Amino acid sequence: EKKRVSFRPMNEDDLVLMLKWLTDDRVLEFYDGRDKKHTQKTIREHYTEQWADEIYRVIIEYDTIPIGYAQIYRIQGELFDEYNYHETEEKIYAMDQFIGEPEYWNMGIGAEYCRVVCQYLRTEMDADAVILDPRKNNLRAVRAYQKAGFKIIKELPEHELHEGKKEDCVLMEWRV
Ligand SMILES: NC[C@H]1O[C@H](O[C@H]2[C@H](O)[C@@H](O[C@H]3O[C@H](CO)[C@@H](O)[C@H](N)[C@H]3O)[C@H](N)C[C@@H]2N)[C@H](O)[C@@H](O)[C@@H]1O
């Protein structure tokens, strides 16, 4: 009887939603940055680019309402160097995500989405670990990920250019 967080593959029609969310300064403060001036063209170019061999773009849904976005990609090849993550034979996925409808913030939805997608990547992709790299100043997001079982592994100084500053991030990892 409990409402469920789910996700589904992003399709071309969802680019309308993405334009709405990523021209909303409330969202851009936490994802992409308020200095980014998105258009239909930039959204298409950036959100259909296949910059990894294995990438899934998904719409996060709560009670069938589309409320956010995630990108999930297998770390392979040069992608390991982007996290100074030592390559082994383990299968590693990284993820970025945002909730674009702010009325669904601070409801535990972020942590619950993390739990659902980790169980999916484990059971359907045999993922060994899932990694995240939130900004250190986003303690809300760090706390939410830790509640979903992501362990803090190490700090990533000057990791992410965000609104004109190189921000320190936190490497976080889920295994079980
Ligand atoms: N989490 C919030 C942030 O998430 C993304 O940033 C992520 C990059 O996408 C990843 O990089 C991959 O995508 C790049 C193109 O974007 C490629 O150049 C690169 N080779 C790819 O490995 C990088 N590893 C982690 C970083 N968190 C958004 O971009 C950023 O706006 C948003 O605020």
Numbering used by the authors: 3 to 178
What did the original publication write about this model?
The AAC(6’)-Im structure was solved in both the apo-form at 1.7 Å resolution, and as the binary complex with kanamycin A (AAC(6’)-Im-kanamycin A) to 1.95 Å resolution. The kanamycin binding site is in a shallow highly negatively-charged pocket in the molecular surface. Strands β3, β4 and β5 form the base of the pocket, with helices α2, α3 and α4, strand β6’, and the loop between helix α3 and strand β2 forming the walls. The kanamycin A molecule is anchored by twelve hydrogen bonds, four to the A ring, five to the central B ring, and three to the C ring. The A ring is further stabilized by a hydrophobic face-to-face packing interaction with the side chain of Tyr34 which serves to help orient the ring such that the N6’ side group is positioned correctly for acetylation. At the opposite end of the substrate, the C ring is also held in position by a face-to-face hydrophobic interaction with the side chain of Trp54 from the α3-β2 loop. Despite the fact that there are only two sequence differences between the two enzymes in the vicinity of the binding site (Asp35 and Glu85 in AAC(6’)-Im are glycine and aspartate, respectively, in AAC(6’)-Ie), there is a significant shift in the orientation of the substrate in these two enzymes. When the kanamycin A conformations are compared it can be seen that in AAC(6’)-Im, the A ring (containing the N6’ site of modification) is rotated approximately 45° relative to the A ring position in AAC(6’)-Ie. This, in turn, moves the B and C rings in AAC(6’)-Im towards helix α4, Asp136 and Glu85. A hydrogen bond between the N6’ atom and the side chain of a conserved aspartate (Asp99 in AAC(6’)-Im and Asp105 in AAC(6’)-Ib) serves to orient the nucleophilic nitrogen atom so that it would be correctly positioned for direct transfer of the acetyl group to the kanamycin molecule in both of these enzymes.
The monofunctional counterpart (AAC(6’)-Im) of the acetyltransferase domain of the bifunctional enzyme has been identified in both Gram-negative and Gram-positive clinical isolates 14. It shares 60% sequence identity and 83% similarity with AAC(6’)-Ie. When expressed in the Escherichia coli JM83 strain, AAC(6’)-Im produces resistance to a wide range of clinically important 4,6-disubstituted aminoglycosides with minimal inhibitory concentration (MIC) values 8 - 128-fold above those for the recipient strain. Here we report the antibiotic susceptibility and kinetic profile and the X-ray structure of the AAC(6’)-Im acetyltransferase in its apo form and as the binary kanamycin A complex, and classify the enzyme as a member of the AAC(6’)-I sub-family C. An analysis of the structural features involved in substrate binding provides insight into the modulation of the activity of these enzymes.
